[PDB]
Amino acid sequence: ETLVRPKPLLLKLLKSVGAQKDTYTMKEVLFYLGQYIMTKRLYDEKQQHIVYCSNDLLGDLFGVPSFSVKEHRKIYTMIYRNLVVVN
Ligand SMILES: *CC(=O)Nc1ccc(NC(=O)C*)cc1
Ligand SMILES: [Cl-]
Incomplete structure (x- = not known):
């Protein structure tokens, strides 16, 4: 089971939803x-796999104004760049 420590912007996102530990x-x-x-109700109300993130913390993490939760490699890439693997 892989343990990770988020970099600061991702850690800020986690804190905003009450996740405050160091390692995940x-x-x-x-x-x-x-x-x-x-x-935060960021998803498109009709096409609910679309996530809007312009002008949100999440937009600075992804560097784009929206993404789909179907885009697992894009999500992988964002998360990987924003953490350190500790085991
Ligand atoms: C409802 C829907 O489209 N779900 C869904 C499940 C799995 C995946 N992707 C993979 O299994 C890699 C996309 C969408
Ligand atoms: Cl924000």
Whole structure:
């Protein structure tokens, strides 16, 4: 089970949904990303796999104004660049 420590911007995102520990599993990071999208209601109301993130923290993490949760490699790439693997 791979343990990770998020870099500062991702750690800020996690804190905004109450995740405040230093080390996470990958499952946890993606779980909290989902909670962030849900609780901020960032998804398109009709095409709910589309996530809008312009002018949000998440937009600075992805560097683009929207993404689909179907885009697993794009999500992988964002998460990987924003953490350090510790085991
Ligand atoms: C509803 C829907 O489209 N779900 C879905 C499930 C899995 C995946 N991707 C992979 O399994 C890699 C995309 C969409
Ligand atoms: Cl924001």
